[PDB]
Amino acid sequence: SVYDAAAQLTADVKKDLRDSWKVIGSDKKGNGVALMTTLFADNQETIGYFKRLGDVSQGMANDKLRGHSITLMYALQAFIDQLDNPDDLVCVVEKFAVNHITRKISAAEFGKINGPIKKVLASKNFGDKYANAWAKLVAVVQAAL
């Protein structure tokens, strides 16, 4: 249940998400591409899903990958901005969930983004505490897949 998942976002979790986002969200192009390249490096079996982006190994030099990465960061921005109202958070999550359901992405495969997020956070000096907070937000999307 996406509603039960959203209920797991306690005051402390919401605070950790906001505090860490203030840093990671400050460079959407840089961190967005970092997230994607890490996903492809640690989970090469997911590359096939991104056929439209072309050669993803080119990273930042790939115009389609850069546009996608920046856009992805705005989806995360949308989640953070909706933390105050669970009903609005849910409708935004379900919108993006549909984008992945049509792509045949399961809850388990979507969860593969947790590794990259933990690594990007760590590179900015945000440890397991923050990684776990983000895993709970990702869990809300998983509940809708």
Task: Provide the sign of the torsion angle of the four alpha carbons 124, 122, 66, 14, taken in this order.
Answer: negative
Q: How far is it, in rounded angstroms, from Cα 145 to Cα 141? A: 7
Pick one of ligand HEM, its own copies, none as the site partner of residue 63 (Cβ within 5 to 8 A by kind).
Answer: its own copies
| Binding-site partner at residue 109 among its own copies, ligand HEM, none, CB < 5 to 8 Å by type | ligand HEM
76 and 14 Cβ atoms separated by less than 8 Å: no
Residue 56 or 131 with smaller CB distance to its own copies:
56
110 touches ligand HEM (CB under 6 A): yes
Residue 100 makes contact with ligand HEM by CB under 6 A: yes
DSSP per residue, 28-90: HHHHHHHHHHHHHHH-GGGGGGGGGG--GGGGGG-HHHHHHHHHHHHHHHHHHHTTT-HHHHH
Answer for which of 14, 112, 119, 136 binds ligand HEM (CB under 6 A) is: 112
Which of 5, 34, 76, 83 is in the footprint of ligand HEM by CB under 6 A?
76
| 70 part of the interface to ligand HEM, by CB under 6 A | no
> Could you tell which of ligand HEM, its own copies, none binds residue 112, using a CB distance below 5 to 8 A set by kind?
ligand HEM
| Residue owning tokens 């991104």 | 50
Q: Is 100 annotated as a binding residue?
A: yes
CA distance 68 to 50: 10
Residues near ligand HEM, by CB under 6 A: 46, 49-50, 52, 68, 71-72, 75-76, 96, 99-100, 103, 105, 109-110, 112-113, 138
